Amino acid sequence: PQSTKRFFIIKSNRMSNIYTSIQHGVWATSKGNSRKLSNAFTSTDHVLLLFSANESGGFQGFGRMMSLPDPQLFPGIWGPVQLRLGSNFRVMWLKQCKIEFEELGKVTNPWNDDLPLRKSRDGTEVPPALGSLLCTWMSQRPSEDLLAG
Ligand SMILES: *O[C@H]1[C@@H](O)[C@H](n2cnc3c(NC)ncnc32)O[C@@H]1CO
Numbered sequence: 001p002q003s004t005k006r007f008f009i010i011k012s013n014r015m016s017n018i019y020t021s022i023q024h025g026v027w028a029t030s031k032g033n034s035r036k037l038s039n040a041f042t043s044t045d046h047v048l049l050l051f052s053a054n055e056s057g058g059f060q061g062f063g064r065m066m067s068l069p070d071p072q073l074f075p076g077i078w079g080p081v082q083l084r085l086g087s088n089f090r091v092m093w094l095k096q097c098k099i100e101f102e103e104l105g106k107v108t109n110p111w112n113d114d115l116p117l118r119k120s121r122d123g124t125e126v127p128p129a130l131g132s133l134l135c136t137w138m139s140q141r142p143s144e145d146l147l148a149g
Contacts, residue, residue, distance in 0.1 A: 005046045007131025008037065011122035013054045017078055019147055021051075025066070026074050027091045033123035034069050034086025041065050049091060050134055052120070058100040060146055062135050066090035097141040104134075 010027065012018050021027050027049065029037060040047045047065040052058060067073070069087035076082045101118035108114045112124050120126075126134070 002043045003128075004044070005048060005128055005132065006040050006044045007048045007050060007126045007128065007134070008040070009117075009120040009122070009124040009126065010049045010051045011054055011120070012051065015053050015056075018051060018053055018060055020077060021091060022093055022096065022146060024074060024077065025090055025092060026077060026088050027063075027065075028069070028078065028082070028085040028088045029123060030084070031086045036123055037065060037089075038068050041068055048131060048135060050126075050131070050138075051093075057102070057118075058098065059134070059138060060098070060144075061093055061096040062138055063091045063093040066092050094135075095138045095141075096144050096146045097138045098144045099138055099141060 010029070028034070037047065048062055049065055050062045051060050053060060067090040069089045071087045073088040073090065077088065078085065104117065107117045107130070109117055109120065109124065109126055109130070111127055112120060117126070
């Protein structure tokens with residue numbers, strides 16, 4: 001499928017990887033999600049990534065996928081978990097913020113089996129009407145210095 005904008009929820013089990021992503025403009029995901037994001041990148045004008053650390057209760061910001069996975073990009077930057085991930089790709093964070101899932105009220109995702117937004121696994125796609133609004137709301141918040149600490 002070809003389209004203008006697509007939106008994916010990214011989960012991280014460690015805050016340090018979010019900090020590394022922000023400092024270096026890089027991400028990597030599971031091998032299966034890497035194929036999904038790669039297919040989206042080559043078929044979509046803009047692939048937006050909405051970042052939510054595990055057990056953080058919400059989103060820390062969003063960014064645009066800028067390149068395809070590349071084994072030569074920052075090899076091994078995540079440590080040994082690199083072995084369980086696809087290759088690294090460039091991401092440009094467009095906003096760092098704090099928005100809790102609870103602030104959005106009850107929201108479910110029709111592209112993810114009617115699961116609550118807060119129950120999204122890594123790589124979950126959201127429909128464009130919802131994804132666009134999530135990015136708009138994030139952009140309208142004050143920027144948060146996530147690297148504080
Ligand atoms: O639920 C997810 C998730 O939080 C985690 N995940 C996926 N991709 C990453 C990265 N990329 C650098 N860093 C930390 N955690 C990550 O994996 C589980 C699924 O096993």
